[PDB]
Design a protein around this ligand. Structure first.
Ligand SMILES: *[C@@H]1O[C@H](CO)[C@@H](O[C@@H]2O[C@H](CO)[C@@H](O)[C@H](O)[C@H]2NC(C)=O)[C@H](O)[C@H]1NC(C)=O
Ligand SMILES: *[C@@H]1O[C@H](CO)[C@@H](O)[C@H](O)[C@H]1NC(C)=O
Ligand SMILES: [Ca+2]
Lengths: 465, 165, 55
């Protein structure tokens, strides 16, 4: 794909009193749409068609002012755009000498400056807006009918607005922002763990920056979405109702401003949701293109860690060493078994006390060697449960990369490294107990040595008798 | 209980309840007396009648809370669940002996209280294949043996700094 | 049981329990891996228990 973003049009500003929302797209305010719907309103009668002439000229002038102000914020917008393109692409950050936190700092500065230019030039635009809609207030105080006029234009415009509301697709945007939000919050968590996991911080800085920008896009999309839904719901709330035929001037003015404000909000809203949809999907493609660079290094950490955790070479040292001690014990033992089997038949009950000494040490010999066998059986049992844990992890590790869906793969690799992090707790106790049994094997090796030496001096004794 | 990780999760949860904007979030603390392991490993050994040599079974990772610090030798009698019905149908006398039971059907403290009532001297507790099918036979577990609840060194009154302990 | 038996407050406790006992409850093995291997879908079940305690 592309490492950079084409449209920078999602940045925005509103006034400090929250009275007016601006945008980057045409015509940058919703009340211009309100003045166009007010212009077909003004084409409906004659006393106000003189005003559709007048505010045709006025609203065109305001449109020229807004477009020129947006032009100055274009020549600031490139200065923001370069700082975006530095941060999104890793090797483009690798060309320069400047560090990350300073470039993010100046990015915050130039974002505040861009937002400032739209704010101030649109302040002068807002002074123009207050003059215009003040003269719109003069229009519906100018009408010749005080309470004579009907409500036919209002209900007809309920009908026209209702069909246009039936046109627009709401549910796919709704399910869309639900799915994208769920993937986003999952992404923030898994980057939060993988930040402490991986070594190389360059890619993770670029990813985290795109997470911040994506969050800004999601909040804007929620604002325009909720405002559209509230507008359509309030128009259907007007579409319920009890229908009057005759109206006084002052209340009909409030009805007209209400419904015109509503569809004006709508026709601004679907455009904003359109652009936010497109650029949002682009940023999602960027984050895919970075995590694809990450998971190969992540797999290298997993392969390093599986050898480290499960205590394997030490364990095989214990097992081979213990079986070696068993082999030496059976070796020296059998080598003395022939002489012992001569020595038991030899004395002919000649001596009693030292014979009691002999079969003491003989029972100690046999029970000691059988105890060595049971010890080795225990050690190999704990080891095979430990290996069963490991082969469960490896048997998962074979069927992980067969999926290949370019974003959940990092998640499965994080899941398996999280699974070794789970398994350590019990593996440590298994290895501890194996160490204890090997200490027992050392003590029994000492006992079997001194007992065999005793039996040798004993056969020397009965040879003396 | 009372480790550093518990305080980290504690200040995490209090940080969450502060973040959810509840109407009031407040913290309380007590000072209790629990039973923890020490440096010397607690263990279990077959002792021969000869006493000449010693066989280790295991150094178990588990421990029972509020057990008495002691050491006992003696014969071992299987005592299926230690329930009063399961003690009344028992073939051999239980006095002066150690019982072994399998885990289930009642709390640990009622097993130890019943085997204490029939004048035994020690209780070993395990879990087996029929009730608990687990792949490995090596894992060890934990329980408390206090009949009734609460901090047992302050019965009926709370364990603050106000009560002088 | 301390709430109901001691203070005199009506108390409730509920589980989505299985016929046999949960095998590794106070042991060293009890972790999320063996849990999600045991119960294959967890979000719907804990969704239901949270729904009951909401009711
Ligand atoms: C409240 O009681 C606790 C008892 O747990 C006191 O804390 C202990 O005080 C002793 C004596 O100075 C020391 O072992 C430690 O300072 C405390 N022990 C632990 C484990 O923390 C405490 O001083 C009492 N008073 C207050 C105001 O908390
Ligand atoms: C239990 O202890 C000894 C040994 O079996 C026995 O003589 C005694 O009668 C038994 N009962 C009591 C109450 O000590
Ligand atoms: Ca108390």
């Amino acid at each position: 794909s592309t490492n950079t973003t084409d449209n920078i049009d999602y940045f925005d500003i509103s006034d400090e009193s929250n009275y007016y929302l601006i945008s980057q797209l045409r015509p940058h305010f919703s009340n211009i749409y309100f003045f166009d719907e007010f212009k077909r309103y003004a084409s409906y009668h004659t006393e106000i068609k003189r005003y559709e002439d007048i505010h045709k000229t006025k609203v065109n002038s305001l449109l020229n002012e807004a477009s020129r102000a947006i032009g100055i914020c274009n020549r600031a917008k490139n200065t923001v755009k370069g700082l975006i393109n530095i941060l999104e692409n890793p090797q483009k950050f690798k060309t320069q000498r400047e560090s990350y936190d300073v470039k993010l700092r100046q990015y915050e500065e130039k974002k505040e400056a861009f937002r400032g230019c739209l704010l101030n030039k649109n302040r002068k635009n807002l002074d123009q807006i207050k003059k215009i809609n003040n003269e719109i207030r003069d229009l519906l105080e100018k009408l010749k009918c005080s309470q004579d006029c009907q409500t036919n234009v209002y209900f007809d415009m309920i009908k026209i607005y209702l069909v246009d509301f039936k046109k627009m697709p709401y549910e796919n945007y709704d399910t869309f922002i639900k799915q994208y939000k769920n993937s986003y919050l999952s992404g923030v968590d898994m980057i939060r763990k993988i930040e402490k996991q991986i070594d190389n911080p360059v890619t993770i800085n670029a990813i985290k920056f795109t997470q911040k920008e994506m969050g800004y896009i999601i909040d804007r999309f929620e604002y325009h979405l909720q405002k559209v839904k509230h507008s359509i719901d309030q128009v259907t709330a007007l579409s319920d109702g009890v229908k009057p035929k005759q109206v006084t001037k002052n209340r009909l003015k409030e009805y007209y401003f209400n419904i015109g404000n509503y569809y004006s909000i709508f026709k601004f809203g679907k455009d904003s949701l359109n652009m936010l949809n497109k650029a949002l999907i682009h940023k999602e493609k960027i984050v895919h293109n970075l995590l694809g660079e990450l998971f190969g290094h992540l797999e290298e950490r997993i392969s390093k860690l599986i050898d480290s955790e499960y205590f394997i070479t030490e364990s095989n040292n214990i097992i081979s060493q213990s079986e070696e001690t068993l082999k030496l014990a059976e070796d020296v033992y059998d080598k003395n078994t022939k002489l012992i089997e001569d020595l038991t038949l030899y004395p002919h009950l000649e001596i009693n006390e030292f014979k009691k000494d002999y079969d003491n040490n003989v029972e100690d010999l046999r029970e000691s060697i059988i105890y060595i066998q049971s010890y080795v059986s225990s050690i190999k049992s704990a080891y095979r449960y430990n290996v069963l844990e490991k082969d469960s992890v490896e048997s998962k590790q074979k069927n992980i990369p067969a999926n290949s869906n370019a974003q959940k793969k990092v998640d499965e690799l994080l899941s398996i490294i999280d699974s070794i992090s789970y398994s350590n707790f019990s593996v440590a106790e298994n290895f501890q107990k194996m160490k204890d049994y090997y200490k027992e094997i050392e003590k029994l090796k000492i006992k079997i040595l001194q007992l065999i030496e005793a039996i040798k001096k004993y056969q020397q004794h009965v040879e003396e008798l | 209980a009372g480790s550093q990780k518990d305080e980290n999760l504690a200040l995490y949860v209090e940080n969450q309840f502060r973040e959810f904007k509840l109407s009031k979030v407040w913290r309380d603390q007590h000072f209790v007396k629990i039973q923890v392991k020490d440096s010397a490993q607690n263990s279990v050994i077959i002792v021969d009648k000869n006493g000449r040599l010693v066989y280790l079974v295991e150094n178990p990772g588990g421990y029972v809370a509020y057990s008495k610090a002691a050491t006992v030798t003696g014969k071992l009698v299987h005592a299926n669940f230690g329930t009063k019905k399961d003690f009344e149908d028992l073939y051999t006398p239980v006095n002066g002996s150690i019982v072994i039971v399998r885990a289930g059907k009642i709390t640990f403290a009622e097993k130890v209280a019943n085997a204490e009532s029939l004048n035994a001297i020690g209780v070993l507790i395990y879990m087996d294949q029929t009730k608990f099918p687990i792949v490995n036979a090596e894992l060890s577990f934990f329980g408390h043996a206090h009949l009734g609840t609460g901090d047992p060194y302050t019965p009926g009154f709370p364990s603050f700094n106000h009560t002088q302990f | 049981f301390p709430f109901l038996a001691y203070s005199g407050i009506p108390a409730v406790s509920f589980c989505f329990c299985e016929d046999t006992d949960y095998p590794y409850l106070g042991t060293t093995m009890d972790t999320y891996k063996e849990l999600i291997e045991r119960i294959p879908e967890l979000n719907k079940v804990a969704r239901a228990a949270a729904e009951v305690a909401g009711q």
